[PDB]
Design a binder for this molecule. Structure first.
Ligand code: CA
Ligand code: CA
Lengths: 571, 280, 565
């Protein structure tokens, strides 16, 4: 396989070990965003051309799902070659061109990297099956009977009948948590651990800013256990962190762990050292709770998981996004014991309809603009670093019939021109068709259309990111829930302390009041601690009456919200 | 008909200042006991296609022609939705003002579902296209072949009959049709709106127009925010000390009015309708 | 103990049509999916009762027999070709009673119904297979082909070579391998077990008792498996089919048995049976490579790719009849039939840019011909005038398109576009609930392509297609007449004569996109007057000299050869 110094590195951004705590991530598929070679398939060079838009929107880091050479039997999460970008997207050189172009305008790039399994077409697995006594015979978990690890569940219980599949060439069973064509790597083999660490090092040498390590809970398998979250799994992740900290300071490691908050906190590592595994993990059940909270018109389903989330290390940062399912397994996280909303979800008609299918923000909220704003407002003001999904800024829809994961992977709708301005190719050649319905269609929903009026959802979304970037409190500030008498209104305060002195938009206290009810609601808040302070609404720089000893009254419209800067009284 | 109300309301939202509305309301002379003003949300008289103005008595006289939006539609009838660039929040505000201001209101057909217009058909025909009932052929207006229609239905991506029609909006109570229906349902439950007195409350914030309708048997309070940004207003409702404001669309009780100024906070182009209810 | 299953007596038998053993030779079949045609319960899924409501349209169009793809209870992991229960119609389509209601309603207006019935394999969810794996010593232990190794029948190929790594899959409950030609969740029935043969014959008898008019026996070449062979078309396979025919002829005269055999014409002729008895297996088989040849013939603007397979088709028994349709792939395997030796166009297809684009995907007639109306007419004209009974696919009469991205087989299974109203008039349900979305592009979209729109002008494709079936039904020559190719000097023009001993009809087709003249030799009909069928116009009488006809690009004529007075 190739080497790093056979492609030349991209530009290195100034070393900063906290960028990911302040960043706003933008998940964008390479295939979906823009096509520059009129093949009907979005490519790296196209994505490079549209970086000016990304910059203008105000996102800080791109998150690319897997773009490695793949047979694409499982949406490219089945990697055939770790050192080769899929032909249709371009060459490794084209990726460096993207990196350099993105870094030039301060935009970072991270990527999905599946750790647990490779495609059965990967050269390793072909060498393991054909040459069992060769150097790759122990790269995958082989067996003579499928009795091993019987406590481990079948993830895709409707597609796979067993986690052991019989290979005809080697005449043996091979282990796989996922699909039968995605054999599990044997992480007990020391050579395998070194091989995957070299894969990390390759892209890090090219100058990538980080990874999202997919399917990491399933790395190691041990008898008498469900083969999930085993100590040796965590031990390997600690090596990856060390390799990052030692060789490339200021890079990030995201952990895709689709588990309850109380479990994923272990993936940040030993808290005594302030973290020695992953920098970020995803707080998965936030969106399902926020969703049900708006359904009930009660704040408590949000309050509960925020209260029940354990504290994380100093380096660590939560990752949050507005989706109900994990893109890997298409499963909504839930714990039968620790989730009190466990039985509740299936009973809700709206939740029940989209079980196992990725949906965009706009369809999830039935295209209600006021709601889209509220959910976005919560995403940007709640603790942890937020991830925006491409096209949600202009309120694109989805096409469910294309597949449970493809539904949200249609082409980006740039103009109302042919193919929504995504490609010059004939409509038949497109990898997926653009949205054509009366509601979310490219004739009515596109970037070009929304660029003009500052009332558009694109421009609204853009400005909200502009406001968020002006106050550190949102990114890395404390979080204290204010409560209130009205159950329908969720109010809280983010706060950052005066480091060696100052009184700017840096060392702020900010107040967020969100109304989960569809009707207008009054809330009497207790802000005595900020007596004398002047609340200033951020989107308009309007001064409200100063806070006193008596409860402060705020009135919101249905699904409305306010963002106040708590400003000091004048000495 | 009180003709210059709409042009003033329009310019008032443009400036984000209450005073162009306040002024004509203050400068309107009192009318007889039997008499009643008629008000509608249009800038031109359908007969002459002229916007009323008095060179002396209108202080906004020169102002209108200078506004780019006003200048574009001079002499052409336009619907409410296009007049406000299809801004749903504005459509609600203007409707909310129409129903709560003194005099009997006139709705124009199709404005309840936010239909548009076709300006190229003629300065008066622009607002006389067929009513869009369904997304079926001819918008469900006729069975005849499309060529036979007296005027063609709206077919653009925004106000087209494929996306704007009665059938579509009947289902979700969040639709503009259902919203508009309910606002008329609320208005019919309080006489104050129809034939009550009108006292403007003023306030410190110039962007917020607050007033009270009263019958001697509700007192109702209307607070309208003309600014596109969220606005706070401190109102003086000492006269109704002890009274409990109850928001009409949700029957929600707000904190009782005291001696200190009452603080209400509105979102951009928002409004509230409170029933002032006696203490027990 | 044992698998319950209901009985034929427990439901109403539908009305029975007068017994006629040649109806299938004269019929024009209409393949229509139950899920796709019309939804009457606003669930977003087309159903039997909806299809019943729209029978008046079907009648009006002028088709003689409905062909329904599998509608049995199924997990639908392979488009319903994986049957879970042979005696239960899939819940979403309705009850068995609703099927009888459809039958009776269809027979009342002379319309017959046949259905796809997979013979080779059942779903792994079928009660039989669950009993075979759980109770290996029970009464179903030998219903499927079990083994201790994945070594048997190594000569047999893997049909889906990109999805399945082996034709043997290991069952965890039984701890044994089970054979399957198709997908791993579609285990093969063991036809060496006599009980299995009787079970499947009782399945046939159930629906035949209800009063169904026939079946299309799917995947029949793969029934029996023998060592030292590719496990295809084995003698014992044919022997079983002979029983099915006998059971039809003895118990229900005037019913039909279609054979889905995706093989070269010279091979499928064996599925009609022993020609000495005039047929003792299937009544019909499909002539699969006709369309690919017609297609390439129009591409080349040469008649010969059509002429060649017509010349190389062996004669079939007296009872027998060919089945022809205008598609390039078999809906079961999504494979285009080809024989490396016997097909001379073998290498040619992959080299054609148009053919290469749609490999493995079902496409409709309209997209296949790039929406060229003149071509759509020509291909339809050939389908109706060439030997054998034709099958129309639903929606092709109004020139619907497809959505390829929905899947290689779902592409042609979108909802029937009835009106330009919401959901193309297919359902009242919200658009999200629909089983598949209607076509929405500028070309084949339901706003521009639907039945309601086309009903009015007699120039529409619907009305044109309707009338062509009306003409075809007026001359028996097309259905069961002889076929003699007239040739001609111009290679771009395919001319031939159908004859019954009581019309002689003449068909001239121009495969070139430019206008073409052809000098035909019709001396045998000297003195006869050719009469064009669509206008009843008399042409000049045929003489001794060559007859000259001139056609426009992709044009055709249909003449009735009428006697002199
Ligand atoms: Ca593993
Ligand atoms: Ca078999």
């Amino acid at each position: 396989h190739p080497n790093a110094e056979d492609f030349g590195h991209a530009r290195t951004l100034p070393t900063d070990t906290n960028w990911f705590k302040h960043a706003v991530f933008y998940e964008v598929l390479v295939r979906a965003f823009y096509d520059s070679n009129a093949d009907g398939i979005g490519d790296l060079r196209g994505l490079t051309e549209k970086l000016d838009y990304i910059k203008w929107l105000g996102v800080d880091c791109l998150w690319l799902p897997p773009f490695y050479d793949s047979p694409l039997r499982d949406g490219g999460y089945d990697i055939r070659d770790f050192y080769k970008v899929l032909p249709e997207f371009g060459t490794v050189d084209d990726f460096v061109t993207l990196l350099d172009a993105a870094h030039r305008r301060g935009i970072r790039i991270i990527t999905d990297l599946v750790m647990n399994h490779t495609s059965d077409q990967h050269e390793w697995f072909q060498e393991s099956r054909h040459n069992p006594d060769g150097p790759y015979g122990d790269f995958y978990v082989w067996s003579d009977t499928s009795d091993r690890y019987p406590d481990a569940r079948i993830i895709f219980v409707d597609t796979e009948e067993s986690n052991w599949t019989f290979d005809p060439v080697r005449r043996q069973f091979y282990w796989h948590r996922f699909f039968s064509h995605q054999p599990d790597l044997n992480y007990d083999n020391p050579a395998v651990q070194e091989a995957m660490l070299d894969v990390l090092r390759f892209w890090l040498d090219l100058g990538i800013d980080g990874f999202r390590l997919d399917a990491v809970p399933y790395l190691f398998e041990r008898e008498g256990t469900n083969c999930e979250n085993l100590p040796e799994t965590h031990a390997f992740l600690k090596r990856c962190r060390k390799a990052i900290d030692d060789e490339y300071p200021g890079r990030v490691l995201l952990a895709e762990a689709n588990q309850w908050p109380a479990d994923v906190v272990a993936y940040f590592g030993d808290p005594d050292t302030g973290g020695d595994e992953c920098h970020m993990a995803f707080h998965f059940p936030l969106m399902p709770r926020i969703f049900m909270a708006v359904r009930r018109e009660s704040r408590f389903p949000i309050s509960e998981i925020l209260a029940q989330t354990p504290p994380i290390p100093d380096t660590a940062q939560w990752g949050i996004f507005l989706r109900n399912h994990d893109e890997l397994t298409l499963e909504m996280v839930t714990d039968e014991e620790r989730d009190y909303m466990y039985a509740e979800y299936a009973k809700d008609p709206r939740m029940k309809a989209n079980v196992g299918i990725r949906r965009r923000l706009a369809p999830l909220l039935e295209n209600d603009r006021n709601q889209i704003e509220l959910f976005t407002a919560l995403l940007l003001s709640l603790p942890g670093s937020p991830v925006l999904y491409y096209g949600d800024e202009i309120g694109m829809g989805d096409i469910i019939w294309l597949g449970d994961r493809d539904s949200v992977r249609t082409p980006m709708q740039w103009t109302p021109d042919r193919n929504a301005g995504f490609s010059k190719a004939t409509p038949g050649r497109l990898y997926l068709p653009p949205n054509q319905d009366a509601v979310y269609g490219y004739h009515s929903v596109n970037v070009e259309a929304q660029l003009d009026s500052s009332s558009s959802l694109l421009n609204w979304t853009r400005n909200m990111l502009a406001v968020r970037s002006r106050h550190d409190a949102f990114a890395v500030g404390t979080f204290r829930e204010l409560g209130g008498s009205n159950p329908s209104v969720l109010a809280y305060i983010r706060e950052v302390t005066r480091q060696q002195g100052d009184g700017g938009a840096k060392t702020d206290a900010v107040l967020c009041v969100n109304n989960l009810s569809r009707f207008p609601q009054p809330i009497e808040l207790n802000l005595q601690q900020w007596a004398g302070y002047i609340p200033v609404e951020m989107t308009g720089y309007v001064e409200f009456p100063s806070i006193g000893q008596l409860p402060y009254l705020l009135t919101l419209p249905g699904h409305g919200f306010y963002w106040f800067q708590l400003r000091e009284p004048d000495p």
